[PDB]
Amino acid sequence: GDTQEWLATVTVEQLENDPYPIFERLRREAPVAWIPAAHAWVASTWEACRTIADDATNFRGGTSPMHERVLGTDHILGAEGETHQDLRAAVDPPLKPRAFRPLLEEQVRPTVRRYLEAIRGQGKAELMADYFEPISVRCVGDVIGLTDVDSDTLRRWFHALARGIANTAMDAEGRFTNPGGFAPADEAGAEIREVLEPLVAKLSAEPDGSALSHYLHHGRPHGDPRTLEQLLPSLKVIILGGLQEPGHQCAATFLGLTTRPEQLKRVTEDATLLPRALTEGLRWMSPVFSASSRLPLREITMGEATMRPGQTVWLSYGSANRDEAVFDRPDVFDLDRATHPHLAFGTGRHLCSGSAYAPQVARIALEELFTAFPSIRLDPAHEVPVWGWLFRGPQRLDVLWD
Ligand code: HEM
Ligand SMILES: COc1cc(C)cc(OC)c1O
Numbered sequence: 001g002d003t004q005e006w007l008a009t010v011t012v013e014q015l016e017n018d019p020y021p022i023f024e025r026l027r028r029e030a031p032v033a034w035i036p037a038a039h040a041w042v043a044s045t046w047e048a049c050r051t052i053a054d055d056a057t058n059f060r061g062g063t064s065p066m067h068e069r070v071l072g073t074d075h076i077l078g079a080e081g082e083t084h085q086d087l088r089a090a091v092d093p094p095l096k097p098r099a100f101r102p103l104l105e106e107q108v109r110p111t112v113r114r115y116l117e118a119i120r121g122q123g124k125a126e127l128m129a130d131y132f133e134p135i136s137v138r139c140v141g142d143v144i145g146l147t148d149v150d151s152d153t154l155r156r157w158f159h160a161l162a163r164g165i166a167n168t169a170m171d172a173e174g175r176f177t178n179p180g181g182f183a184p185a186d187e188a189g190a191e192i193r194e195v196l197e198p199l200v201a202k203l204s205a206e207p208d209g210s211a212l213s214h215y216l217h218h219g220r221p222h223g224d225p226r227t228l229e230q231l232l233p234s235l236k237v238i239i240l241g242g243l244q245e246p247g248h249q250c251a252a253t254f255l256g257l258t259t260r261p262e263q264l265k266r267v268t269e270d271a272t273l274l275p276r277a278l279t280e281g282l283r284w285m286s287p288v289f290s291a292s293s294r295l296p297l298r299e300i301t302m303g304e305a306t307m308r309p310g311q312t313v314w315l316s317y318g319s320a321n322r323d324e325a326v327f328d329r330p331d332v333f334d335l336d337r338a339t340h341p342h343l344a345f346g347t348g349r350h351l352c353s354g355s356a357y358a359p360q361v362a363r364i365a366l367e368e369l370f371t372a373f374p375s376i377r378l379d380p381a382h383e384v385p386v387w388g389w390l391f392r393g394p395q396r397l398d399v400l401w402d
Contacts, residue, residue: 004304008036010037012038012169016388016389017387019392020322023322031302031303032044032302034305037169037170039172039174040064040293040314042290043315043316045325046321046323046325046343049315049317052313053348053350054347058297059294059297059313060294061078061084061293062077062312062314062315063078063293064168065174065176066164066165066166067293069164070164070236071233071240074229075234076234089219090214091353093218094144094214095143095353100143100360107139107142112135112364113368115130116368120372123401124379124398124399124400124401125398126398127397128247131365132250132251133247136243136244137151140238140243140354144235146195146239154243155243157188157191158239158241161189161236161239162240163184164182164186165291166388166391167181192232193232199212200212200216201228204227241354245288249281249282249287250362250366251393252282252393253278253281253366254281255386255394256284256285258377263334268374274363275359279342279359280334280335280337282321282344284333285393286342287344287391288344290317290318290319290389290392292315292346292350293312294313295313296309315343317346318344318389318392321342321343326340373399375401376399376401378400384396384398
């Protein structure tokens with residue numbers, strides 16, 4: 001009763017601006033809990049998240065009214081069975097190491113160095129807009145068919161879609177209380193479709209082996225390519241998270257390192273520590289903090305939570321990765337933390353398709369930054385605003401160097 005009374009007082013604003021004390025209490029008191037402000041359940045412990053994520057018998061891939069509005073109905077996150085296998089066939093192969101490894105030095109590092117040289121000329125930087133986001137959107141956009149879309153547009157798109165997903169304030173009846181918050185996503189969606197539809201039409205009839213051609217034709221009979229609507233919601237999943245998350249991994253890892261000066265110094269002197277740092281960054285401030293989700297396939301009870309079909313169950317992998325039962329002092333960033341899996345890429349059949357590629361983009365981005373500016377530090381003139389409980393990360397990351 002005490003926990004339910006407290007949850008009735010939690011606002012979306014509190015979740016966005018100060019989630020850690022909320023999830024700390026949930027992990028202790030209610031591993032799965034209904035959040036009235038969001039009209040949805042959230043799972044907060046490692047075991048609640050892992051079990052719900054993996055259990056393909058009692059839960060299906062998640063969705064929500066924001067997913068449907070922003071992405072479309074039949075997106076890969078929500079898909080199961082042959083439909084999910086088919087969408088994974090479309091998106092997965094270009095993201096495997098056998099496919100992307102040559103691009104790391106041919107494409108990714110040159111892209112990173114272009115942005116590195118731009119900030120070198122400034123003598124300081126706001127690393128989100130000036131470095132991490134352009135690198136992320138270019139390196140990912142260039143491998144998902146958006147080679148001809150400029151970085152400003154790609155950043156605008158992911159920010160708009162991510163804002164739409166986060167626009168989850170709902171009343172007791174499940175009605176949006178801020179429908180105007182979808183206007184950026186609605187416009188981004190129209191622009192995305194206007195770019196992709198002519199490419200899909202062309203490549204459907206005359207395949208060329210580019211990324212979108214594979215999305216249409218790989219694993220399909222000749223004469224039965226995927227259609228625009230079969231792909232578009234999933235392409236929007238990738239335009240949101242494929243473009244946003246790598247920049248957040250970089251920023252989370254950078255910020256975490258700044259909290260441990262001796263570890264930051266070690267990493268600047270030895271780039272081979274970056275994979276370990278990046279893994280700890282994902283655990284310490286998981287970019288997809290609670291935007292993963294499942295839906296129940298039957299009425300199912302976990303503790304006081306009796307979940308029913310159609311209801312969103314958000315999986316706070318970011319809270320799971322902060323669970324005191326699994327990690328010692330989980331609120332601390334520790335480059336040398338004892339080896340253990342994390343949930344920042346999820347688990348099971350819906351495990352992130354980008355889980356091998358994203359850490360390589362981030363590794364190269366940080367390698368170049370720390371090699372060029374080993375004296376880099378946070379700019380004390382500007383706070384580092386960290387925001388979000390669905391998607392979480394630094395909004396701005398002003399730095400100085402000597
Ligand atoms: C560090 C960066 C990234 C993080 C932290 C991240 C995290 C996640 C998470 C948590 C999920 C949901 C897993 C679940 O529900 O259990 C997911 C799904 C997915 N991600 Fe990633 N992601 C990242 C980068 C990327 C990139 C770069 C791409 C593609 C270019 C991508 C493509 C996908 C796809 C297609 C799915 C859907 C998989 C499915 O439902 O079967 N992600 N991601
Ligand atoms: C709702 O939106 C998303 C949710 C997740 C878990 C991952 C994504 O991208 C990989 C998304 O776009």
